[PDB]
Amino acid sequence: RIWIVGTNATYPPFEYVDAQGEVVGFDIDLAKAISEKLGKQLEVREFAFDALILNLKKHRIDAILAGMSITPSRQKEIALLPYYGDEVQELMVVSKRSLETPVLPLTQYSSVAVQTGTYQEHYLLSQPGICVRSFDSTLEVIMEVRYGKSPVAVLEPSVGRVVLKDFPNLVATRLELPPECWVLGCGLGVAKDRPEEIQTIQQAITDLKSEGVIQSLTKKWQLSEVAYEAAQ
Ligand SMILES: NC(=[NH2+])NCCC[C@H](N)C(=O)O
């Protein structure tokens, strides 16, 4: 009957809280489409990002849609079905335009702002000489920079490309990741002991891709490289 998708709505444009108090975004739109393919009614529930895997494992939720990067370590705990993105080999470092080059390396700073429980936080914490401050939300991370409280932050590029549009005084610099910290694109999480749901859900994703629904949705939430609309 009900299909519970766990998420952490802290994370534009995948899932976040709008001006009205409503949870919206690319993942939410996808969860809606998928639940329709599944014959089930969608319910979205909020958890801390780091709590999602355990809830899923325990079947306190039925799936995860949380912009969750595919990594081997996560794959040991659950299934992650590819639905967006490609390999990530770099990160953005955000700073005020006023901050003098070189922005790199990150060891030069009093702190570096980053979102909690994320692979990019774990990268920073494994590097020598980085003082990390971690926050609930992407906005908090960026506000920490524009408010002068951290000289720099780190975002994922797919996220940074979208969010930084609204901050004309911030600038972003590529920071290549060591190949041992490259991750894959985003996967929809399903418990590993549920193969039947895996297949069903995999088939819903392939169907939405075929139908052009996933392309529409990636455009709608600015997750695709922008194309021109050409009259033919
Ligand atoms: N809804 C969220 N808070 N998502 C955070 C995902 C960040 C990054 N893609 C990771 O998987 O570690």
Side-chain angles (χ1 to χ4, degrees):
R1 201 87 160 210
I2 305 311
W3 190 48
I4 298 172
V5 176
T7 192
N8 176 76
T10 250
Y11 196 60
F14 284 100
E15 49 260 333
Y16 61 101
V17 172
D18 71 359
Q20 247 64 223
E22 284 164 347
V23 185
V24 302
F26 176 78
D27 279 339
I28 307 301
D29 283 356
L30 187 59
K32 221 160 314 173
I34 288 179
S35 65
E36 279 158 26
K37 292 293 188 181
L38 302 180
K40 274 182 189 174
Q41 164 176 15
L42 169 66
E43 214 192 71
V44 185
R45 291 287 159 267
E46 171 82 9
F47 300 85
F49 181 73
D50 36 291
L52 276 160
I53 292 304
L54 191 36
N55 284 108
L56 177 70
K57 247 168 180 274
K58 302 214 289 190
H59 317 292
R60 311 205 176 169
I61 60 185
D62 304 322
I64 302 172
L65 278 159
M68 176 165 293
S69 297
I70 296 158
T71 75
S73 152
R74 289 176 178 163
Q75 295 171 295
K76 293 178 223 297
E77 326 310 324
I78 80 279
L80 279 169
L81 304 179
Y83 68 87
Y84 167 76
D86 289 287
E87 201 176 57
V88 171
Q89 310 179 344
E90 49 175 50
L91 289 180
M92 287 178 185
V93 174
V94 183
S95 56
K96 288 157 165 282
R97 187 186 314 282
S98 311
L99 189 279
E100 228 9 65
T101 75
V103 56
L104 299 187
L106 294 174
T107 56
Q108 70 188 294
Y109 297 113
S110 58
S111 62
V112 180
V114 78
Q115 192 183 22
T116 348
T118 69
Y119 80 87
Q120 60 271 28
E121 181 198 31
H122 171 88
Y123 162 75
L124 293 169
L125 289 169
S126 333
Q127 312 304 127
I130 308 286
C131 175
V132 181
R133 298 164 54 97
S134 67
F135 306 80
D136 196 36
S137 77
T138 297
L139 265 290
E140 289 177 321
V141 167
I142 293 163
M143 289 301 193
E144 180 84 347
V145 181
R146 60 128 58 153
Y147 286 28
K149 287 297 187 154
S150 278
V152 292
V154 164
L155 297 179
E156 308 159 82
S158 72
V159 164
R161 288 229 191 272
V162 186
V163 188
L164 292 184
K165 280 139 112 80
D166 295 333
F167 298 80
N169 299 342
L170 301 184
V171 292
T173 87
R174 56 118 214 21
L175 162 51
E176 248 254 272
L177 283 165
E180 87 270 358
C181 277
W182 295 5
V183 299
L184 292 168
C186 289
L188 179 162
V190 187
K192 250 163 176 208
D193 62 322
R194 295 307 169 64
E196 321 81 349
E197 298 186 58
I198 297 297
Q199 177 53 75
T200 298
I201 295 179
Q202 275 176 168
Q203 182 71 237
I205 294 170
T206 95
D207 292 344
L208 293 161
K209 255 208 188 54
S210 309
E211 295 154 28
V213 168
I214 293 184
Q215 203 59 24
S216 275
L217 286 192
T218 55
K219 214 324 76 221
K220 170 180 179 184
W221 292 105
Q222 321 182 82
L223 278 175
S224 264
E225 83 189 349
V226 175
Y228 290 96
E229 237 55 56
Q232 261 103 157

